[PDB]
Design an enzyme around this catalytic site. Structure first.
Site, PDB file in Angstrom:
ATOM      1  N   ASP A 168       0.895  -1.175   0.000  1.00 45.72           N
ATOM      2  CA  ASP A 168       0.000   0.000   0.000  1.00 45.72           C
ATOM      3  C   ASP A 168       0.926   1.216   0.000  1.00 45.72           C
ATOM      4  O   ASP A 168       1.540   1.513   1.055  1.00 45.72           O
ATOM      5  CB  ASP A 168      -0.951  -0.015   1.190  1.00 45.72           C
ATOM      6  CG  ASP A 168      -1.829  -1.241   1.373  1.00 45.72           C
ATOM      7  OD1 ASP A 168      -1.739  -2.198   0.574  1.00 45.72           O
ATOM      8  OD2 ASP A 168      -2.609  -1.209   2.333  1.00 45.72           O
TER       9      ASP A 168
ATOM     10  N   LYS B  13      -7.146   3.189  -1.957  1.00 53.81           N
ATOM     11  CA  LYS B  13      -7.316   3.061  -0.499  1.00 53.81           C
ATOM     12  C   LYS B  13      -7.517   4.458   0.069  1.00 53.81           C
ATOM     13  O   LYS B  13      -6.782   5.375  -0.324  1.00 53.81           O
ATOM     14  CB  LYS B  13      -6.093   2.344   0.072  1.00 53.81           C
ATOM     15  CG  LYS B  13      -6.005   2.311   1.587  1.00 53.81           C
ATOM     16  CD  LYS B  13      -4.896   1.435   2.090  1.00 53.81           C
ATOM     17  CE  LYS B  13      -4.630   1.620   3.569  1.00 53.81           C
ATOM     18  NZ  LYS B  13      -3.725   0.570   4.071  1.00 53.81           N
TER      19      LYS B  13
ATOM     20  N   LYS C  97     -10.399   0.112  -0.813  1.00 56.76           N
ATOM     21  CA  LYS C  97     -10.150  -0.183   0.615  1.00 56.76           C
ATOM     22  C   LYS C  97     -10.546   1.021   1.458  1.00 56.76           C
ATOM     23  O   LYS C  97     -10.056   2.129   1.205  1.00 56.76           O
ATOM     24  CB  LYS C  97      -8.701  -0.587   0.891  1.00 56.76           C
ATOM     25  CG  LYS C  97      -8.404  -0.772   2.369  1.00 56.76           C
ATOM     26  CD  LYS C  97      -7.093  -1.451   2.635  1.00 56.76           C
ATOM     27  CE  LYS C  97      -6.758  -1.467   4.106  1.00 56.76           C
ATOM     28  NZ  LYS C  97      -5.353  -1.854   4.354  1.00 56.76           N
TER      29      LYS C  97
END
Length: 250
Positions: free
Chosen positions: A101, A166, A200
Site C-alpha cells: 500500500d 485506499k 479499501k
C-alpha cells in the site's frame, strides 16, 4: 441477521492491524493469531515491511498460509520523491509482501502537480507486478478533502495501474468517510475498471453497523457479488471486535 451476514462478510475482507503498534515481533505474532478468528480468517494483515518475515513464519505455523501480508511504503507522509517510494517498495517486495500500500503524493497534487503522482504510482506498480505483488494506492482522501481532488487522485492512481485505491493511512485526523468511499467507488465505476481495481476503506468504520453501511455502497454501485477480497478491504483494528461481537464472540 442481515447484520450477521454483513459482519462475517466484512471480517473476511479485513486488512487487520492493531491501534497502537504491530511492529514488535511479539505484537506482530499476536496480530497473526488475532487474524485467525473463530468464524474465519481476515483477508490480510497490514504491518510494516520489517515485520513481514516473522509474520510469514507465524501465519504458516498456525496453518493460515492464505492470510495475505500487506505492508506500507512512502508511508505515512506521501512525499513526492519517487526514488525513495520505489526503494521502499522494492524492499517490501524483498521482505516477502503479498501487497504493498503506497502513499500517493497527495500534497504534490494539492499543489497542482498531477504528473508526479502518475509517475510514482506507475513505477511502484511495475516493481510490484514484476514480483506478483498487488499495489494499493493510499490517496489520503482525509487530507485532499476536496471532492474534485479525491476524484483526481483516484483517476491518476487508476491510470498509473493501481490494483486498489485506499482512502487513508489511518494516521491522520480524517480517514475514510462514507462520502469519500462513495466518490472513490464512483471513480472505479466511471472509469470502467471494476474488474481490475479494488477499494479499501481505512478507518471510519468502527461498528458492525458501519461495516454494513460501507459494503452497501459497493453493493449499490456494482451489485452484491463485486466486493470480494480482490475488490474490497476494511483497513481496521477495533472493527474486528465489533464484527465478532455481532457474530456472538466477545
Amino acid at each position: 441477521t442481515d447484520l450477521k451476514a454483513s459482519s462475517l462478510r466484512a471480517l473476511k475482507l479485513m486488512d487487520l492491524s492493531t491501534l497502537n503498534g504491530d511492529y514488535t515481533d511479539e505484537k506482530v505474532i499476536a496480530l497473526c493469531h488475532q487474524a485467525k478468528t473463530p468464524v474465519g480468517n481476515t483477508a490480510a494483515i497490514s504491518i510494516y515491511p520489517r515485520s513481514i518475515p516473522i509474520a510469514r513464519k507465524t501465519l504458516k505455523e498456525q496453518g493460515t498460509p492464505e492470510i495475505r501480508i500487506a505492508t506500507v511504503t512512502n508511508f505515512p507522509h506521501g512525499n513526492d520523491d519517487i526514488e525513495i517510494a520505489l526503494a521502499e517498495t522494492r524492499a517490501a517486495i524483498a521482505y516477502g509482501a503479498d501487497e504493498v500500500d503506497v502513499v500517493f503524493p497527495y500534497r504534490a497534487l494539492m499543489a497542482g502537480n498531477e504528473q508526479v503522482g502518475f509517475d510514482l504510482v506507475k513505477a511502484c506498480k511495475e516493481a510490484c507486478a514484476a514480483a506478483n505483488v498487488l499495489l494499493k494506492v493510499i490517496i489520503e482522501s482525509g487530507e485532499l478533502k476536496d471532492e474534485a481532488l479525491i476524484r483526481k487522485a483516484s483517476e491518476i492512481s487508476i491510470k498509473a495501474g493501481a490494483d486498489f485505491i485506499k482512502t487513508s493511512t489511518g494516521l491522520v485526523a480524517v480517514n475514510a468517510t462514507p462520502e469519500s468511499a462513495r466518490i472513490m467507488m464512483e471513480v472505479i465505476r466511471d472509469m470502467g475498471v471494476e474488474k481490475s481495481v479494488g477499494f479499501k476503506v481505512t478507518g471510519g468504520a468502527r461498528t458492525a453497523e458501519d461495516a454494513q453501511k460501507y459494503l452497501a455502497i459497493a453493493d449499490e454501485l456494482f451489485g452484491a457479488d463485486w466486493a470480494d477480497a480482490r475488490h474490497y478491504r476494511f483497513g481496521a483494528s477495533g472493527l474486528l471486535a465489533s464484527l465478532l461481537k455481532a457474530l456472538g464472540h466477545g
